[PDB]
């Protein structure tokens, strides 16, 4: 920070945009389709209904903050006028953990959900790729009942699984693990500390999308990690999952006679308590212990780790989470938190069900332009005042051409105005209901009758 | 020279330094979160807003987070550099990012009616993170210029529906003030305001009669050499410092332009505003509408189109919301098709900062028990039962007596408290009304007992 550094800086901020860069920023960009935005709205609304059941309010998310040493070159890095290097979020937990550690003493909600954007940086002058994330978090100010709170987060995911068509009839499972278990397995297997973060990162793909143990062992023995053949064969003794009571037994036997047995046992007791509470919450998706669980383990140091998976032959991640007390502490220049993160638009939005809801229930139409723009409007505003969703049609010559113009919409009813305050109603949410002429004073009563 | 190697050298260098620690703690020293009360009120407001929007068939559209800086903003804008040295900004409003995307995405279909929630940012000087405010926009976007005034009246109607829905506004007097960018420019011609000063003139005029900024304060700022409008022009502009209802106001404007070239030029513009007023009546807009010929809020965004503000029509006036038709801001982004009209509203400051909508509870039922072990067994069991029947409920902390529990939760407000006792027995304290006595029921009956209380 010499006088050199600061004059060039203010000069950088007065430089005019290279036109080629201004075009590169959004060349080729698209907007989601209008039906996409309607499926997004249904999903977001369904999700919020679930969270609110638990007494959860929505919390805000930080838009940007001083960069984290933890991320590689996929993070979007930005310089402000003081020269400090800031980033856009790669996940929501980093910002929330920072908040919990820096924001002055105050009451925070114990249960909270948040919708935010996360960003992957591009190299070709284009704007960053954006993705939607949703988190649900339970934040407490004492170490009382940490396992109960963790079971509640699992329960929320199970409720999500039940409410959506893409998950509620697909085989689904949870895999539970724990940071202390993973680090004791690492001690047991004599993995050097310098290699453990990359080891955990490789292990986070295990049995996901055909990344089988053979693939894992290649990456672990490669220069990308550098673990010895002896250490990798010992880690392989933990490449399994099982139901909790069996799993605890299998793990205790692996560690029998070692200096790690006591600390492993402590850890298994906590995982058992989370299993007990999940039965009391009546979690319906099956639960396994997977001792090499490791998704984002760096954020969950000392805490539980869990993933929610599509339990088909080739498995895929649906959501993941963990207890990230330690990520709060690492930001301290007496709060605890557990939660999950989920890419709801990818897992649930991208495709008689919840998606049967209509963007708009009533199209108000008419084949007289002047009737459309007088009586059409009065009907329209009357529907809105009674809570009914409606919009005005464009001009049209005949019902043949009106239904042709609106091929790509789905209404419950089309209401056609004609002379002498008479309406024709085409029922569109059902294909066995003929058209009917009613007096306009009767439109409300006619609608309430068909619901 | 922008082709100067000092530029790379300092960029690469500065992206490689690690955060000066004092700067890391300054970013959020003493930053405060909303209270849990604030958060439930923000949830209620946002929910009422979305109910109004969905009535019109609107869906939520995403908003851009950042983009190359615009020259339309002052030093308030948050500026940031990416690794190429491109200067980017955080938004100061949602219309800029929306108009850019409409111009640059090309692509295909766009929802006709859309709302969006987004953050806007004011820069600071003290190394603290920027101030953030929450904005909501409602926009009508079409590929055809058909029924232009009708779409504009719907946006006005939406604001009228919002006024009716919130106690903040439903009782207090409100008014709409409509103008038009062509009217404003024609007034600038007639008053002989030099083209080079018109942008500064409209920025000053956008404060007129807001928060005590009377005309004499307006005259001060236009005469000052920063702006430099002649005293003869400022007095001719004063001939337009008024508002009237539409028919009267159209008449005053024709009288003022009578016998000049501008009589005929303003004519088509006055007809457009007349059509918007009449579609307002058809939409049953209750808030009174004035024509204010010097309307100029963000006029740079609304060249060639209507402008309008929604005001607290008290003695001293303030802005509730504002907007206009920004076809031309879309056109200004075309690299060298789309028409859009909408409003923007700082919904947290206007509606969320304090039956009624704000009576709804964050949590309906507190599940409690004075036996620690019952709390953590049947407590949890009752809890998931409720959640499976759509009822909001949370578990209580340990408590020795109801005196203890009721005050541990003194700063909370439930509609029922449920105390589990030995056997399948519940003691229920009704908490919304203070005239209902405690009733002991069977656990097997909690559902029907609640269904029969609402």
Short mmCIF file of C-alpha atoms in Angstrom, two decimals, chain B residues 58-59 61 94-95 98 102 111-116 136-141 151 155 158 324 326 339-344:
data_model
loop_
_atom_site.label_atom_id
_atom_site.label_comp_id
_atom_site.label_asym_id
_atom_site.label_seq_id
_atom_site.Cartn_x
_atom_site.Cartn_y
_atom_site.Cartn_z
CA UNK B 58 -47.43 -12.46 -12.51
CA UNK B 59 -44.50 -14.73 -11.71
CA UNK B 61 -38.29 -13.12 -12.35
CA UNK B 94 -33.74 -2.97 -10.37
CA UNK B 95 -34.73 -1.26 -13.62
CA UNK B 98 -33.74 -5.48 -16.04
CA UNK B 102 -34.05 -7.30 -22.05
CA UNK B 111 -43.19 -13.35 -18.99
CA UNK B 112 -45.67 -10.55 -19.70
CA UNK B 113 -46.29 -9.78 -16.03
CA UNK B 114 -43.46 -10.24 -13.57
CA UNK B 115 -42.41 -9.14 -10.14
CA UNK B 116 -38.94 -9.29 -8.61
CA UNK B 136 -39.55 -4.79 -5.14
CA UNK B 137 -40.44 -4.11 -8.78
CA UNK B 138 -43.50 -5.00 -10.81
CA UNK B 139 -43.11 -4.90 -14.57
CA UNK B 140 -45.21 -5.47 -17.67
CA UNK B 141 -43.09 -6.37 -20.71
CA UNK B 151 -50.58 -1.70 -19.48
CA UNK B 155 -49.10 -0.96 -12.98
CA UNK B 158 -51.19 -2.75 -8.71
CA UNK B 324 -42.49 4.81 -15.70
CA UNK B 326 -38.54 2.53 -19.99
CA UNK B 339 -41.58 -2.40 -24.36
CA UNK B 340 -41.71 -2.31 -20.56
CA UNK B 341 -43.46 -0.23 -17.88
CA UNK B 342 -43.17 -0.70 -14.13
CA UNK B 343 -42.68 0.67 -10.64
CA UNK B 344 -40.20 0.15 -7.83
#
